[PDB]
Design a protein around this ligand. Structure first.
Ligand SMILES: [Mg+2]
Ligand SMILES: [Mg+2]
Lengths: 115, 87, 55, 275, 92
RNA sequence: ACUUGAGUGCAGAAGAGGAAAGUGGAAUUCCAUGUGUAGCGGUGAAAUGCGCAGAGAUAUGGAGGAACACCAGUGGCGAAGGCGACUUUCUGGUCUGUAACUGACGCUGAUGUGCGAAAGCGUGGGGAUCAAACAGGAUUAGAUACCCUGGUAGUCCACGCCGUAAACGAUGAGUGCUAAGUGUUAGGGGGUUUCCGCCCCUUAGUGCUGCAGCUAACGCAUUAAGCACUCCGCCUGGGGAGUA
RNA sequence: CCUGAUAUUGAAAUUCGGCACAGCUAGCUGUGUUGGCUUUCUAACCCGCACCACUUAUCGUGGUGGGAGACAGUGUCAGGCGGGCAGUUU
């Protein structure tokens, strides 16, 4: 008994996580790149995020869903290659939201790099 | 600081000479009205030091005007020391 | 009216995507009249007259 | 602050006193003093309970108002006197009824103050008013615990508390030991931090003035032969040889918790202690 | 000199306690030798974001003139105990 | 006796120059419940580790502490070290135009004395992130190395000290002087002042390009490393050695 | 000392499992009976909680409150730690 929801996708340069939820954020189904079996340097491959967004779509069409809003963030690739997989698995996508925790200048970054 | 509606009063009670905004008498009298007021900021606040460079600066300016005044007038040099308490 | 901060012309000239201030080159402002228009926005955001992040 | 000493003797080598600059009218008020006979751990059987007590200097108890009644009467503050029974100093307020009383003194206090429940009650240092009428983030001390009982928690020198929020019937207090705790909403609270804050740097410096305060020596355990301490003798000095260091009556003392399942303290203590 | 004191009042307290706050605040903003310039409002208006989860609030502006220096910090110590303001600001 | 230097008065602006007190937003970490569930991470590759006892993902929640996105740029300021969220009280110096003002009242400074980036130390608070020391996995024939999840003194505040750096323009201060073009910031001169339109000028900081001159060469070159004057500091082959 | 089982010890509920197979498609539905987890209310019980009387006693009992509440204290039974202490062997 659900009509509309939100389709979170989060694709860092070492993993890919899709979490299609309800409007409160209640987890309908999630489909990570590690879930499909991309054990290795395939989580850095943009092909893996393509099929990582479509395991969660039909797992959310059986709970009832038409129109979602998409929230993405990632320094790595797959940030827009995987959103159109929601179209290629039968799910209406209209709104795109680029949330990114860009800080207001505090809490110093890690300094592992030694040039 | 001292405002410029009250700075003018400092000149008038130290006019041994007539209609002089700058003298070996009157600006020395103005400097003491700041030294007595900078040094009461500097008995409440102490961590600042840019004021305490302006504090050292203004006195050694007066020590050159006063040592000029020692070498012109015998009884006007001694009057200005006795009038305010400043040495 | 570059002076006071309780007007709506601050809302209509300097926003890009988050409410971030547009530079002095792209808008075409002056230099003296950027300092009167900078901190006046900082007082404008503190009284909820304009958003820090708008969308 | 602390007035130091100069090492004219080996006794006064590092001894450090506490300068009495916040004391006015050094003579007491001869109508609020009650006598105080000592006892070193001598209960109603004459035996010895609690150890290391007794002797020193004679004292005389000074009657303190912890209740804070006399609602809606302006109380001046006259003189800030010295109290030996406790770590804070003391005050001599005068209500406008001429009823001179004692108050434990907060941080800065010479002016004149008010006790009233909710009239306006004038939130300043020295004013006592119930915890439903106190806004959040407000440093209080000398809280009551049971309603109308008397102020119990945080009465030391330099102690404090903090109101956090307001729950359905209680309030929520952070104590000085770091233990969040619910208190009923009609307990009073003095607003402020209690004075005499330089107290724990008083280096006593000498085994004699640590001895006329009412303290006796404390013999360590490993020098008693094993009639009377579980760290008994052995040839030479000896490591303790137990799995756990024990108190002189058998119970392990280093680590094991001691409180029991108690009424009206499990449903109220949210956070524990931090040490 | 000239000041201005602005304070955003939270809603649903000025149908009965209207001028039980603002008259007492302008009974303490306007004291110690202060014939004010103008005491007016801007209205129950729109906020740009949420403040303690209030989307709107009353705006009231008091533009006070005196020649005493720090006789207005009573309002900066009355706006804490009064939980009937949600933000405030003094300029000049 | 003189008024160009040096000082005040009056007319005006531009400031991240200090010092106390409040106040505000966004991200990081940890605690409370759900929906939810086999992976989250990390990487040349991998793991060590946290997870299946319900982790990350995901929402409201509340606890703290610290920095201060966008404006922000060659800009500004202070003698330097340095100083960038906002409001308030207190507080130094510099500059533009000059009618006024006593009338050489100067420049330099051996000792003295006062501020000093960070690290470090002393006695108290407070401790999110980053993180020497430290334990761990592999890379290495060997590995605190470099790489990875972890991590304490320290980082922040208040008080008292230690005074060094590629503390640099690698160029000590003070005065006058000598071809010119092109920017930029705060002010003043000629216009109906056209408003960030415009050119016409004069003064002070600020950068670039470039004669005569000087330089071993590089390159400076009106903010001289040019022509001169005053006073101060220092050097005399490289190690031994800023050691005894 | 710690922890259960029952006694003193009452009502209101809301879900969750064992039977019972009640519907008759491994898992649904819903009645007859059993054992829990919680959640809230007050009537016992408890207060080294406030004035008030016995009384010009900070002991006690009696009295309207305010708190906490079928948990705690207590009785019987049962399990686990127990050189703190005892009886003896070597
Ligand atoms: Mg430091
Ligand atoms: Mg034995």
């Amino acid at each position: 008994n659900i009509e509309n929801g939100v389709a979170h996708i989060r694709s860092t340069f070492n993993n890919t996580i899709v979490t299609i939820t309800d409007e409160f954020g209640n987890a309908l189904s999630w489909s990570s790149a590690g879930a499909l079996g991309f054990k290795g340097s395939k989580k850095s491959t943009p092909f893996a995020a393509q099929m990582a967004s479509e395991t969660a779509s039909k797992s959310a069409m059986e709970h009832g869903l038409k129109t979602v809003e998409v929230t993405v963030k990632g320094p790595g690739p797959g940030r827009e290659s995987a959103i159109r997989a929601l179209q290629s698995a039968g799910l209406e996508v209209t709104a795109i939201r680029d949330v990114t925790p860009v800080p207001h200048n505090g809490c110093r970054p890690p300094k592992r790099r030694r040039v | 600081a001292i405002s410029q509606e009250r700075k003018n009063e400092i000149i008038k009670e130290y006019r041994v000479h007539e209609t002089d905004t700058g003298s070996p008498e009157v600006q020395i009298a103005v400097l003491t009205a700041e030294i007595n007021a900078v040094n009461e900021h500097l008995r409440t606040h102490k961590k600042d030091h840019h004021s305490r460079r302006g504090l050292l600066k203004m006195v050694g300016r007066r020590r050159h005007l006063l040592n000029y005044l020692r070498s012109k007038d015998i009884q006007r040099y001694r009057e200005l020391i006795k009038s305010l308490g400043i040495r | 009216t570059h002076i006071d901060y309780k007007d709506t012309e601050l809302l209509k000239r300097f926003i890009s995507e988050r409410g971030k201030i547009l530079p002095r080159r792209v808008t075409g402002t002056s230099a003296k009249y950027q300092r009167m228009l900078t901190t006046a926005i900082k007082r404008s955001r503190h009284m909820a007259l304009l958003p820090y992040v708008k969308e | 602050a602390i007035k130091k000493y100069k090492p004219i003797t080996n006794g006064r080598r590092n001894m450090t006193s506490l300068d009495f600059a916040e004391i006015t009218k050094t003579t007491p008020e001869k109508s609020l003093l009650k006598p105080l006979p000592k006892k070193a751990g001598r209960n109603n059987q004459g035996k010895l309970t609690v150890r290391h007590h007794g002797g020193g200097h004679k004292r005389q108890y000074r009657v303190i108002d912890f209740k804070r009644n006399k609602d809606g009467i302006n109380a001046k503050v006259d003189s800030i006197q010295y109290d030996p029974n406790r770590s804070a100093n003391i005050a001599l307020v005068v209500y406008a009824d001429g009823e001179k009383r004692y108050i434990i003194a907060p941080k800065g206090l010479e002016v004149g103050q008010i006790v009233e429940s909710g009239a306006e009650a004038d939130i300043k240092v020295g004013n006592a008013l119930p915890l439903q009428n106190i806004p959040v983030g407000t440093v209080v001390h000398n809280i009551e615990l049971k309603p109308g009982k008397g102020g119990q928690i945080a009465r030391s020198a330099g102690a404090s508390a903090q109101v956090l929020g307001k729950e359905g019937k209680y309030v929520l207090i952070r104590l000085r030991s770091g233990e969040v705790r619910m208190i009923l909403s009609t307990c009073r609270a003095t607003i402020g931090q209690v004075g005499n804050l330089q107290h724990e740097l008083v280096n006593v410096g000498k085994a004699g003035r640590s001895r006329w305060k009412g303290i006796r020596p404390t013999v360590r355990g490993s020098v008693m032969n094993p009639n009377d301490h579980p760290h008994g003798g052995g040839e030479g000095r000896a490591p303790i040889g137990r799995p756990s260091p024990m108190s002189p009556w058998g119970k392990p003392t280093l680590g094991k918790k001691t409180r029991r399942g108690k009424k009206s303290s499990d449903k109220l203590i949210v956070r524990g202690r931090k040490k | 000199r000239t000041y201005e004191v602005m304070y955003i009042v939270r809603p649903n307290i000025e149908e009965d306690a209207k001028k039980a706050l603002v008259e007492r605040f302008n009974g303490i903003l306007a004291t110690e030798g202060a014939e004010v310039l103008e005491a007016k409002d801007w209205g129950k208006r729109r906020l740009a974001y949420e403040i303690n989860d209030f989307k709107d609030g009353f705006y009231n502006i008091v533009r006070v003139k005196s020649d005493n220096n720090k006789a207005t910090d009573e309002f900066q110590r009355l706006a804490k105990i009064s939980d009937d303001i949600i933000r405030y600001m003094v300029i000049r």
